[PDB]
């Protein structure tokens, strides 16, 4: 099972930069979503969830096939809330129908991170929509009510190491949890990509308690929250070291996140040797737009 990258016929970097810019402009415009968080964080979560179904043991799942567009995956309970990102991207797809679904979903995440002032994330085209029977079954995305051992083991399936895991979890600087989606509770929210996840972990005073849905989470006096899997990153001694590093080095966190996130979005894809180099898209700000 090989998924070969195939460039959308006749398309080049400028075509994709146009897609990037349409997403970026809509992000800027549709500013009231989720109490003024905007759609950035849900697009990041979407890109992660379309990718996180991958299994290195058989090369099934991952971003390549655009299979989130199919009912079984769209309705995965782990994907609750992500319908909002799909709806956001729908008109973008209508504007640029030549882009594959996996390319759009993954590009949405890249665009969101960069527009939220995160690192540049190189991105490659050529994901190809595959048929409904290639849709992975539900249950491949991780549970939040678990400990460090679970996190470490889970991410081995995505070929992620301890540093990659801690870097990718820093995306939890973004957005918030919603009781109706996940059974987790928290009013704190943010739409600027920073290393604040690590700084909160280390600096807040956390108390484990049951929330209003009877699920355990870690809550601070300030009103912030951590999932059990978030908090595991300071419970485990190896994870803790890396949390400290990223709390103390914004640039290292940005570089490590960029590499891990591109890897996440590329897992399962075979790029021919004559494939284009990864594209680094300019932000709207860099374009004077
Ligand atoms: C152990 C791994 C992870 C677990 C258990 C987990 C769990 C969760 C949960 C329960 C939520 C709240 C969903 C909602 O209630 O709306 C959430 C939100 C989010 N997650 Fe994760 N996550 C994990 C890893 C990641 C990764 C690797 C990324 C991306 C690199 C990511 C990005 C996000 C973002 C940006 C949000 C906020 C979305 C919003 O505000 O709508 N997560 N995650
Ligand atoms: C770093 C604190 N925030 C954002 C204010 C936060 N913390 C989290 N632990 C978190 C977990 C899942 C989704 C969003 C999240 N956001």
Measured from the CB, is residue 152 less than 6 Å from ligand 1?
A: no
Find out whether 57 is annotated in a ligand binding site: no
The neighbouring-strand residues paired with 126 are none
Exposure of 100 in the CB half-sphere (CA atoms within 13 A): 22
- Helix (H), strand (E) at residue 219: strand 216-220
Do the Cβ atoms of 218 and 208 come closer than 8 Å? yes
Question: How much distance in Å is there from the Cα of 226 to the middle of ligand 2?
Answer: 6
Q: Which tokens go with 57? A: 């043991």
The neighbouring-strand residues paired with 91 are none
Find out whether 48 is annotated in a ligand binding site: yes
Q: Please name which ligand lies nearest the alpha carbon of 182.
A: 1
* Cα 174 from Cα 38, distance rounded (Å): 11
Find out whether 157 is annotated in a ligand binding site: no
* Expt. technique: X-ray
DSSP symbol at 64: T
Measured from the CB, is residue 189 less than 6 Å from ligand 2?
A: yes
Exposure of 94 in the CB half-sphere (CA atoms within 13 A): 6
Do the Cβ atoms of 3 and 94 come closer than 8 Å? no
Do the Cβ atoms of 83 and 159 come closer than 8 Å? no
Rounded to 5°, angle at Cα 192 from 188 and 193: 105
Tally of CB atoms within 10 A around 205? 8
Dihedral sign from CA coordinates of 109, 115, 116, 120:
positive
User: Which one, of 221, 99, 229, lies nearest residue 152 by Cα?
Assistant: 229
* Cα 142 from Cα 157, distance rounded (Å): 11
Strand order in the sheet with 206-210: 206-210, 216-220, 225-226
- Cβ contacts of 216 within 8 Å, gap of 6 or more: 145, 208, 209, 210, 228
Question: Judging by beta carbons within 10 Å of its beta carbon (0-12, 13-18, 19+), is residue 29 exposed, middle or buried?
Answer: exposed
Q: Ligand 1 atom 18: the closest Cα is on which residue?
A: 177
Measured from the CB, is residue 175 less than 6 Å from ligand 1?
A: yes
* Cα 87 from Cα 95, distance rounded (Å): 13
- Cβ contacts of 249 within 8 Å, gap of 6 or more: 195
User: Which one, of 156, 128, 131, lies nearest residue 7 by Cα?
Assistant: 128
* Cα 135 from Cα 231, distance rounded (Å): 32
Measured from the CB, is residue 41 less than 6 Å from ligand 1?
A: yes
Q: Which tokens go with 150? A: 């679970």
Measured from the CB, is residue 219 less than 6 Å from ligand 2?
A: no
* Domains of the chain from N-terminus onward: 1-141+261-289 (1.10.520.10), 142-260 (1.10.420.10)
* Cα 154 from Cα 148, distance rounded (Å): 10
| Candidate of 36, 82, 173, 195 to mutate for ligand 2, largest count of ligand atoms within 8 Å of Cβ | 173
Measured from the CB, is residue 151 less than 6 Å from ligand 1?
A: yes
Do the Cβ atoms of 92 and 20 come closer than 8 Å? no
Resolution (A): 1.6
């Amino acid at each position: 099972l090989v998924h070969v990258a195939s460039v959308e016929k006749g398309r080049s970097y400028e075509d994709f930069q146009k897609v990037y810019n349409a997403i970026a402009l809509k992000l800027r415009e549709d500013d009231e979503y989720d109490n003024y968080i905007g759609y950035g964080p849900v697009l990041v979560r979407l890109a992660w969830h379309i990718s996180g179904t991958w299994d290195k043991h058989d090369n099934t799942g991952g971003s390549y096939g655009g299979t989130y567009r199919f009912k079984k995956e769209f309705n995965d309970p782990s994907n609750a809330g992500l319908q909002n990102g799909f709806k956001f991207l729908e008109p973008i797809h209508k504007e640029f129908p030549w882009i594959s679904s996996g390319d759009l979903f993954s590009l949405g995440g890249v665009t969101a991170v960069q527009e939220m002032q995160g690192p540049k994330i190189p991105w490659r085209c050529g994901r190809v929509d595959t048929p409904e029977d290639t849709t992975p079954d539900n249950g491949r995305l991780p549970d939040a009510d678990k400990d460090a051992g679970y996190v470490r083991t889970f991410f081995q399936r995505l070929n992620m190491n301890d540093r990659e895991v801690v870097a990718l979890m820093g995306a939890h600087a973004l957005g918030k949890t919603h009781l109706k989606n996940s059974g987790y509770e928290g009013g704190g929210a943010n739409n600027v990509f920073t290393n604040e996840f690590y700084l909160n972990l280390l600096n807040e005073d956390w108390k484990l308690e049951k929330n209003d849905a009877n699920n355990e989470q870690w809550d601070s006096k300030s009103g912030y929250m951590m999932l059990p899997t978030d908090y595991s990153l300071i419970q485990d001694p190896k994870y803790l070291s890396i949390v400290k590093e990223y709390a103390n080095d914004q640039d290292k966190f940005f570089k490590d996140f960029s590499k891990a996130f591109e890897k996440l979005l590329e897992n399962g894809i075979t790029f021919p040797k004559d494939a284009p180099s990864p594209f680094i898209f300019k932000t709207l700000e860099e374009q004077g737009l």
